[PDB]
Amino acid sequence: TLSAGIGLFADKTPISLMAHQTGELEEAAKGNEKDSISLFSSDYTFKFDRFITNVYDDKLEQIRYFFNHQDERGKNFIYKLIELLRNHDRMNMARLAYYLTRLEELTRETDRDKFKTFKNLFYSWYTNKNDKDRKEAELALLLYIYEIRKD
RNA sequence: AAUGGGUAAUUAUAGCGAGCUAGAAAGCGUUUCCG
Protein backbone atom coordinates (compact mmCIF):
# COMPACT_ATOMS: atom_id res chain seq x y z
CA THR A 1 0.00 0.00 0.00
CA LEU A 2 0.95 3.66 -0.16
CA SER A 3 0.65 6.62 2.16
CA ALA A 4 0.37 10.25 1.27
CA GLY A 5 0.47 13.76 2.64
CA ILE A 6 -1.47 16.45 0.84
CA GLY A 7 -0.52 19.96 1.85
CA LEU A 8 -2.42 23.10 1.00
CA PHE A 9 -0.79 26.44 0.43
CA ALA A 10 -1.51 29.83 -1.03
CA ASP A 11 0.19 31.05 -4.18
CA LYS A 12 3.62 32.71 -4.45
CA THR A 13 5.24 30.48 -1.83
CA PRO A 14 8.53 28.52 -1.89
CA ILE A 15 8.84 24.88 -2.87
CA SER A 16 11.29 24.11 -0.06
CA LEU A 17 9.00 25.15 2.79
CA MET A 18 6.15 23.55 0.86
CA ALA A 19 7.95 20.27 0.25
CA HIS A 20 9.17 20.17 3.83
CA GLN A 21 5.74 20.80 5.33
CA THR A 22 4.06 18.15 3.26
CA GLY A 23 6.99 15.88 4.07
CA GLU A 24 6.06 16.37 7.71
CA LEU A 25 2.48 15.57 6.73
CA GLU A 26 3.48 12.36 4.99
CA GLU A 27 5.58 11.40 8.02
CA ALA A 28 2.62 11.97 10.32
CA ALA A 29 0.76 9.75 7.88
CA LYS A 30 3.55 7.16 8.08
CA GLY A 31 3.30 7.16 11.86
CA ASN A 32 -0.41 6.32 11.88
CA GLU A 33 -0.64 2.82 10.42
CA LYS A 34 1.45 3.43 7.28
CA ASP A 35 -1.62 3.14 5.10
CA SER A 36 -2.82 6.61 5.73
CA ILE A 37 -3.44 10.05 4.26
CA SER A 38 -3.05 13.29 6.17
CA LEU A 39 -4.90 16.06 4.41
CA PHE A 40 -3.63 19.49 5.18
CA SER A 41 -2.57 19.04 8.79
CA SER A 42 -0.82 17.06 11.47
CA ASP A 43 -4.15 15.74 12.63
CA TYR A 44 -6.74 14.66 10.00
CA THR A 45 -4.56 11.60 9.32
CA PHE A 46 -7.23 9.20 8.12
CA LYS A 47 -6.77 5.69 6.91
CA PHE A 48 -6.79 5.84 3.16
CA ASP A 49 -9.72 3.49 2.69
CA ARG A 50 -11.85 5.46 5.13
CA PHE A 51 -10.89 8.64 3.32
CA ILE A 52 -12.07 7.23 0.01
CA THR A 53 -15.14 5.21 0.89
CA ASN A 54 -16.26 7.19 3.94
CA VAL A 55 -15.34 10.82 3.23
CA TYR A 56 -15.68 11.43 -0.51
CA ASP A 57 -18.18 8.72 -1.43
CA ASP A 58 -20.23 8.84 1.79
CA LYS A 59 -20.14 12.05 3.81
CA LEU A 60 -19.24 14.82 1.39
CA GLU A 61 -21.74 13.68 -1.24
CA GLN A 62 -24.44 13.77 1.44
CA ILE A 63 -23.31 17.27 2.42
CA ARG A 64 -23.21 18.48 -1.18
CA TYR A 65 -26.62 16.95 -1.87
CA PHE A 66 -28.07 18.87 1.06
CA PHE A 67 -26.67 22.35 0.63
CA ASN A 68 -27.23 22.59 -3.13
CA HIS A 69 -30.90 21.60 -3.01
CA GLN A 70 -32.04 24.15 -0.43
CA ASP A 71 -31.85 27.93 -0.20
CA GLU A 72 -32.49 28.80 3.44
CA ARG A 73 -29.36 27.33 5.11
CA GLY A 74 -26.00 28.59 3.91
CA LYS A 75 -22.41 29.18 4.97
CA ASN A 76 -23.28 30.27 8.50
CA PHE A 77 -24.89 26.98 9.46
CA ILE A 78 -21.81 25.19 8.13
CA TYR A 79 -19.38 27.37 10.10
CA LYS A 80 -21.37 26.86 13.30
CA LEU A 81 -21.34 23.10 12.70
CA ILE A 82 -17.57 23.13 12.08
CA GLU A 83 -17.08 24.84 15.45
CA LEU A 84 -19.17 22.25 17.30
CA LEU A 85 -17.21 19.48 15.58
CA ARG A 86 -13.95 21.15 16.54
CA ASN A 87 -14.83 21.58 20.23
CA HIS A 88 -16.95 18.49 21.12
CA ASP A 89 -17.55 18.51 24.82
CA ARG A 90 -20.25 16.33 26.29
CA MET A 91 -22.20 19.59 26.51
CA ASN A 92 -21.79 20.32 22.79
CA MET A 93 -23.79 17.18 22.01
CA ALA A 94 -26.76 18.73 23.82
CA ARG A 95 -25.99 22.13 22.34
CA LEU A 96 -25.86 20.65 18.82
CA ALA A 97 -29.10 18.76 19.55
CA TYR A 98 -30.80 21.99 20.57
CA TYR A 99 -29.38 23.82 17.55
CA LEU A 100 -30.54 21.25 15.01
CA THR A 101 -33.99 20.81 16.55
CA ARG A 102 -34.28 24.59 16.75
CA LEU A 103 -33.54 24.85 13.03
CA GLU A 104 -36.01 22.07 12.17
CA GLU A 105 -38.92 24.39 12.89
CA LEU A 106 -37.49 27.41 11.07
CA THR A 107 -37.63 25.66 7.65
CA ARG A 108 -40.43 26.15 5.11
CA GLU A 109 -42.33 22.86 5.91
CA THR A 110 -41.53 21.81 2.33
CA ASP A 111 -37.84 21.50 3.17
CA ARG A 112 -38.46 20.43 6.76
CA ASP A 113 -38.34 16.77 5.75
CA LYS A 114 -35.02 17.12 3.91
CA PHE A 115 -33.56 19.17 6.74
CA LYS A 116 -34.81 16.46 9.11
CA THR A 117 -32.90 13.82 7.16
CA PHE A 118 -29.75 15.93 7.30
CA LYS A 119 -30.43 16.54 11.01
CA ASN A 120 -30.56 12.82 11.69
CA LEU A 121 -27.40 12.07 9.69
CA PHE A 122 -25.39 14.89 11.25
CA TYR A 123 -26.50 14.15 14.81
CA SER A 124 -25.86 10.44 14.27
CA TRP A 125 -22.30 11.02 13.13
CA TYR A 126 -21.81 13.62 15.82
CA THR A 127 -22.85 11.44 18.76
CA ASN A 128 -21.06 8.34 17.49
CA LYS A 129 -18.62 7.47 20.27
CA ASN A 130 -15.93 5.94 18.02
CA ASP A 131 -14.49 9.39 16.97
CA LYS A 132 -14.19 8.25 13.35
CA ASP A 133 -17.34 9.82 11.87
CA ARG A 134 -16.72 13.06 13.78
CA LYS A 135 -13.33 14.08 12.45
CA GLU A 136 -14.29 12.62 9.07
CA ALA A 137 -17.38 14.86 9.10
CA GLU A 138 -15.23 17.81 10.14
CA LEU A 139 -12.89 17.25 7.20
CA ALA A 140 -15.85 16.77 4.85
CA LEU A 141 -17.25 20.11 5.97
CA LEU A 142 -13.81 21.74 5.55
CA LEU A 143 -13.54 20.46 1.98
CA TYR A 144 -17.11 21.40 1.15
CA ILE A 145 -16.78 24.92 2.52
CA TYR A 146 -13.48 25.18 0.63
CA GLU A 147 -15.00 24.24 -2.70
CA ILE A 148 -17.91 26.72 -2.47
CA ARG A 149 -16.03 29.88 -1.48
CA LYS A 150 -16.34 32.84 -3.86
CA ASP A 151 -13.64 35.48 -4.35
C1' A B 1 -82.17 41.63 64.54
C1' A B 2 -78.28 44.77 66.17
C1' U B 3 -73.00 45.26 66.51
C1' G B 4 -67.98 44.39 64.80
C1' G B 5 -65.66 42.84 60.58
C1' G B 6 -64.18 41.43 55.24
C1' U B 7 -62.69 36.74 53.65
C1' A B 8 -61.03 32.86 49.67
C1' A B 9 -58.69 32.45 44.77
C1' U B 10 -55.25 33.72 40.58
C1' U B 11 -49.41 36.97 41.02
C1' A B 12 -48.43 36.05 34.92
C1' U B 13 -50.18 32.19 30.80
C1' A B 14 -48.68 30.15 25.50
C1' G B 15 -44.40 31.24 22.25
C1' C B 16 -40.02 32.64 19.79
C1' G B 17 -34.28 31.91 22.19
C1' A B 18 -31.30 34.29 17.29
C1' G B 19 -31.26 34.25 11.29
C1' C B 20 -28.41 35.42 6.86
C1' U B 21 -23.71 37.72 4.70
C1' A B 22 -18.47 37.69 5.16
C1' G B 23 -14.51 33.33 7.59
C1' A B 24 -9.18 36.33 5.98
C1' A B 25 -7.08 39.56 1.49
C1' A B 26 -3.08 41.84 -0.76
C1' G B 27 2.86 42.02 -0.49
C1' C B 28 7.77 40.22 0.62
C1' G B 29 10.22 33.72 0.35
C1' U B 30 15.73 35.91 0.49
C1' U B 31 19.53 40.49 0.23
C1' U B 32 24.61 41.97 1.15
C1' C B 33 29.71 40.54 2.37
C1' C B 34 32.29 36.04 -1.12
C1' G B 35 34.67 34.23 -5.49
Side-chain angles (χ1 to χ4, degrees):
Chain A
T1 56
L2 48 82
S3 63
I6 296 173
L8 182 129
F9 307 96
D11 49 355
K12 291 191 263 76
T13 57
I15 316 101
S16 67
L17 185 153
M18 181 182 287
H20 182 270
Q21 288 184 358
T22 184
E24 292 294 325
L25 299 185
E26 84 170 3
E27 287 293 325
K30 288 292 289 186
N32 192 6
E33 196 64 28
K34 60 178 75 173
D35 196 0
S36 67
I37 168 168
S38 73
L39 295 191
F40 297 169
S41 176
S42 297
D43 47 354
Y44 299 154
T45 73
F46 299 145
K47 298 300 292 295
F48 217 108
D49 188 75
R50 299 290 184 182
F51 176 73
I52 289 174
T53 196
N54 282 318
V55 174
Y56 264 3
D57 290 334
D58 186 73
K59 292 186 187 293
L60 179 138
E61 288 181 353
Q62 289 180 354
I63 292 171
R64 184 181 289 116
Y65 184 74
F66 181 74
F67 290 100
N68 292 117
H69 293 288
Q70 61 92 37
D71 283 327
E72 64 264 13
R73 305 275 75 78
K75 293 280 190 69
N76 194 9
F77 175 68
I78 303 171
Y79 187 86
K80 291 172 68 69
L81 294 179
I82 288 171
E83 182 176 359
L84 292 174
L85 286 165
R86 189 170 294 168
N87 291 319
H88 188 266
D89 297 335
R90 180 64 185 88
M91 187 65 205
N92 290 117
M93 290 183 185
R95 191 170 290 177
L96 183 272
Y98 181 75
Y99 179 65
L100 293 176
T101 308
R102 198 192 70 199
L103 289 175
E104 277 185 350
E105 183 67 28
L106 196 145
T107 56
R108 278 94 170 94
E109 298 293 328
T110 67
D111 295 329
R112 189 173 175 179
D113 50 354
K114 188 174 88 274
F115 189 83
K116 183 172 86 273
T117 60
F118 186 78
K119 188 265 293 181
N120 293 318
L121 267 301
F122 195 83
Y123 186 78
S124 296
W125 61 61
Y126 190 78
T127 59
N128 207 164
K129 189 66 71 177
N130 54 2
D131 203 0
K132 297 175 71 68
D133 290 330
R134 192 181 303 119
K135 64 188 291 184
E136 286 177 357
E138 185 180 1
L139 186 269
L141 285 171
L142 294 178
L143 291 180
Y144 179 68
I145 203 167
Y146 274 156
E147 72 175 6
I148 64 172
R149 184 176 295 178
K150 205 183 267 80
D151 193 1

